[PDB]
Amino acid sequence: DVFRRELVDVEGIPLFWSIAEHWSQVESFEARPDDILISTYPKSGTTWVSEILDLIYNNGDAEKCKRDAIYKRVPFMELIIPGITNGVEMLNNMPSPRIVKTHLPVQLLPSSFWKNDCKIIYVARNAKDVVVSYYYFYQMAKIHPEPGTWEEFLEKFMAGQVSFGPWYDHVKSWWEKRKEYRILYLFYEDMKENPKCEIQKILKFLEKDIPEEILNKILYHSSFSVMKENPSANYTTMMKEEMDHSVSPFMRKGISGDWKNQFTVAQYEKFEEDYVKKMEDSTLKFRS
Ligand SMILES: Nc1ncnc2c1ncn2[C@@H]1O[C@H](COP(=O)(O)O)[C@@H](OP(=O)(O)O)[C@H]1O
Numbered sequence: 060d061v062f063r064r065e066l067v068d069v070e071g072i073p074l075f076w077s078i079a080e081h082w083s084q085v086e087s088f089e090a091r092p093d094d095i096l097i098s099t100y101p102k103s104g105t106t107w108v109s110e111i112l113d114l115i116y117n118n119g120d121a122e123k124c125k126r127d128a129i130y131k132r133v134p135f136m137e138l139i140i141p142g143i144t145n146g147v148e149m150l151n152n153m154p155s156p157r158i159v160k161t162h163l164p165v166q167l168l169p170s171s172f173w174k175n176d177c178k179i180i181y182v183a184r185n186a187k188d189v190v191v192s193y194y195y196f197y198q199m200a201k202i203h204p205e206p207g208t209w210e211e212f213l214e215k216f217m218a219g220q221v222s223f224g225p226w227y228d229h230v231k232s233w234w235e236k237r238k239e240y241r242i243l244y245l246f247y248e249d250m251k252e253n254p255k256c257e258i259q260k261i262l263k264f265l266e267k268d269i270p271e272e273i274l275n276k277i278l279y280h281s282s283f284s285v286m287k288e289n290p291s292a293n294y295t296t297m298m299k300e301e302m303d304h305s306v307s308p309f310m311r312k313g314i315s316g317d318w319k320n321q322f323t324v325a326q327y328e329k330f331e332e333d334y335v336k337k338m339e340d341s342t343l344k345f346r347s
């Protein structure tokens with residue numbers, strides 16, 4: 060059973076056992092100067108932004124963006140599962156210009172990305188909405204350990220004892236990294252509030268000037284209502300052993316503020332007190 064195993068430490072971070080087993084392959088990953096890296100803590104808008112980028116690269120052509128599932132169009136680099144997937148191999152075999160997905164903390168990113176001075180798009184989301192999304196994802200995406208109850212999972216998240224480690228360190232260190240490398244640092248809530256503005260930021264960062272009509276095509280096709288029903292974007296083509304959408308769909312709610320439906324008032328107050336302590340050494344500002 061490749062599924063439901065305990066996480067394994069890799070350089071201080073809990074990762075899937077099979078990533079740890081194949082870590083040298085990830086560490087030695089060969090980036091290319093024109094790669095665009097999409098980097099996120101899990102559940103922060105990775106799929107959304109990956110689809111936006113693929114739409115940009117295909118000039119808004121919806122059919123071209125249905126050439127394969129999102130997880131093949133934009134490989135999850137470090138995800139290697141015996142018999143099932145190998146993000147490193149998928150990328151090695153992909154013609155440029157590549158779009159690369161990672162969830163690695165800054166300090167674990169393969170050094171080739173730095174040496175190639177790649178452009179990186181980092182997406183962050185408010186911690187309370189992330190932990191809710193992650194709870195349901197742990198349930199449906201069987202590679203994860205059992206999350207336990209919501210209470211148990213919330214405590215594990217606050218302690219950083221979840222896949223890819225603590226949210227707090229992830230977002231803070233990637234934020235600091237923007238001073239060293241070209242990192243467009245975006246917020247899920249901004250994309251919710253004004254997606255046109257945020258896609259324009261992506262276009263500027265990519266040094267692309269496209270017609271308004273193409274921008275509007277990209278906007279339309281990257282909305283939640285469209286993506287949730289799109290089998291090339293909604294993970295429903297995933298092998299059933301890997302993801303059970305009957306437990307929770309990948310495209311679950313796609314809102315900001317679902318935390319209010321999940322947190323008790325006491326959990327919220329406790330989470331906030333803890334949050335303030337952890338985030339005091341960072342300029343970061345989030346909206347819930
Ligand atoms: N086009 C879109 N607009 C808004 N949210 C989207 C979206 N596509 C995916 N999402 C949401 O992004 C989260 C998945 O993030 P990731 O791609 O990083 O795993 C899920 O959040 P919820 O579980 O809160 O609904 C999912 O519904």
Ligand SMILES: Oc1cccc2ccccc12
Nearest residue numbers: 101105130135162200202
């Ligand atoms: O984004 C992810 C994080 C962790 C595991 C995943 C498995 C499949 C597809 C996406 C995943």
